[PDB]
Amino acid sequence: YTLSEKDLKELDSIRDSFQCMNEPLDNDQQASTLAKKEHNPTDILNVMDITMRRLVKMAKRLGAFNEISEAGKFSLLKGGMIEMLTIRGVTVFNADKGVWQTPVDGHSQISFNMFDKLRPDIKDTQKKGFLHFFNLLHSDVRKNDLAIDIIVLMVLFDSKREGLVSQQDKETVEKLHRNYESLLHRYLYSIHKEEAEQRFASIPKALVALRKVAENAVTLFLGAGNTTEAASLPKEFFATNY
């Protein structure tokens, strides 16, 4: 049935936090890297920089996020960044076309076969692991902005990230996670009661796949060629010999 006014207020807050995700780049070097007919490893790192900076901006403008200590903020971001990227990758990915279509830049696509340039002995596993995670997030849920926005906040507030040592941080993250999950539960029933329960019960399995896929993604740029000119931020998460 319908959502309470309190839930709607929360969903408004969440809608405002993520409204920065799908918006035009006011940069030209950035829009140039996207509209690029070709994406080598250096270019992929540059594209990631865009989503990551936007991811970090979204975390800052989040009330719940500003309830954690400074040390807790860093640990949450560093630890869930590849996971949130991947989620973001799920939501703009075209299964049949095999490319990523960003809403912020029409006529701009990124080949799924860019993995073919990445670490040789691992690119195949990561390709398969990405389609796996994707295939665990049904269409109806993947197309729902709010639904995926909620899951993005559940992976963000992971009480088990390396570095969350403050008992206070751990407690507040745990509570935030519980509430976000509940919201998603009631939200799912309000938009499609027919099979909300099985849909909600399957997403934790998908989150297990996301973790695993993101985790062995860190070395993907080893053996991929010179990336020295790539943006610096993404290189703090992806190992390089340059």
């Binding site: 400074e70 860093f74 703090e236």
Partner: peptide, 10 residues
């Protein structure tokens, strides 16, 4: 010291 951290602070 860590662009991530700086992005957080600023």
């Amino acid at each position: 010291k860590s662009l991530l951290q700086q992005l957080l602070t600023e």
